[PDB]
C-alpha cells in the first residue's frame, strides 16, 4: 500500500527527531485547521464473534465489515447503498429496490445502525469536516484490529484512526495531507502538519501516541503479506 508506506515515512521522520525533547516545545505553531479530515469513524461496534464490525462515519453514514470480507455501506440519505465484494468490486443499489441476495446483510446493517444511534456517543461531534458530500467520495473500512490499548481503523482513503480505550484520546492520520488530528481527553480537536511538529516539537502525550501510531502502521504493513 502506497498510502501506508507514506504514513510510515512521515511518522518515522517526526519520531526520529524526538519532538518532545526540545528545549522549547511549540506544538501550537504546527496547527493547521485547513487540514482537518473530511471523514473519521464516529462510532463502532465490534460484533466480530458473530457478524462483523459496524461503524458510523462523521457524516452519519454507516458501514459494516462482515466476517466474510464483504462490506455494506448505507449513505446518510438512509436508502442508498454501496456493496464492496471480497475482491474489492463496488456496486451501487438501494434498500428500496429490495435486492433479495442482500436482504440479510441489509437487516444486520440496520441493527448496527440502530444500536449505535441508541447507545453510543458520536466522536468529533463538536467539529466540522473540510468539504461537503460532492467533493467527498465515501470511504470504507478496509481493515481493523484491537490491541490492549486501542482499536486501529484503516479507511480506504489511506486514513488511519486510533482510538485509545484508557482515556478516550484519538488520532486521525492522513497521509495525503501529512497531517494528524488529535482528540484529547477533553474532546478538543487539533490538526497538525507532521513536518511542523518535527520542526517545532510537541508535548510528550502526542509524541508517545505518535510513536504508538508508527508501531501500528508497521503492523498494518506486515499484515499485508
Amino acid at each position: 500500500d502506497c498510502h501506508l508506506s507514506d504514513m510510515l515515512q512521515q511518522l518515522h521522520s517526526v519520531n526520529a527527531s524526538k519532538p518532545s525533547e526540545r528545549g522549547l516545545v511549540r506544538q501550537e505553531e504546527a496547527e493547521d485547521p485547513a487540514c482537518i479530515p473530511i471523514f473519521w469513524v464516529s462510532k463502532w461496534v465490534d460484533y466480530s464473534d458473530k457478524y462483523g464490525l459496524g461503524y458510523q462515519l462523521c457524516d452519519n453514514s454507516v458501514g459494516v465489515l462482515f466476517n466474510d470480507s464483504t462490506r455494506l455501506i448505507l449513505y446518510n440519505d438512509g436508502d442508498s447503498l454501496q456493496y464492496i465484494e471480497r475482491d474489492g468490486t463496488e456496486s451501487y443499489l438501494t434498500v428500496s429496490s429490495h435486492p433479495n441476495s442482500l436482504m440479510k446483510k441489509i437487516t444486520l446493517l440496520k441493527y448496527f445502525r440502530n444500536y449505535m444511534s441508541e447507545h453510543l456517543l458520536k466522536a468529533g461531534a463538536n467539529i466540522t469536516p473540510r468539504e461537503g458530500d460532492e467533493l467527498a467520495r465515501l470511504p470504507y473500512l478496509r481493515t481493523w484490529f484491537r490491541t490492549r490499548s486501542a482499536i486501529i481503523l484503516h479507511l480506504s482513503n489511506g486514513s488511519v484512526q486510533i482510538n485509545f480505550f484508557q482515556d478516550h484520546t484519538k488520532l486521525i492520520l492522513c497521509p495525503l495531507m501529512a497531517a494528524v488530528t488529535y482528540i484529547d481527553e477533553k474532546r478538543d480537536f487539533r490538526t497538525y502538519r507532521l513536518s511542523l511538529l518535527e520542526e517545532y516539537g510537541c508535548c510528550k502525550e502526542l509524541a508517545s501516541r505518535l510513536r504508538y501510531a508508527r508501531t501500528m502502521v508497521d503492523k498494518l504493513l506486515s499484515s499485508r503479506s
Binding site: 462510532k43 465490534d46 444500536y115 441508541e118 456517543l121
Partner: protein, 35 residues
C-alpha cells in the same frame, strides 16, 4: 435494536460523557461549594 442483538464490545457509550455529566451537576442542586 433487535433484542438478541447484544454486541460484546463497542465504542464509548452515551452515558460515558463526563463533560455532559459534570455539567448537569453544575446546573442541578448540590451541597455547598468552596467560596
Amino acid at each position: 435494536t433487535y433484542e438478541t442483538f447484544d454486541p460484546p464490545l463497542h465504542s464509548t457509550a452515551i452515558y460515558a460523557d463526563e463533560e455532559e455529566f459534570s455539567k448537569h451537576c453544575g446546573l442541578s442542586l448540590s451541597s455547598t461549594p468552596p467560596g
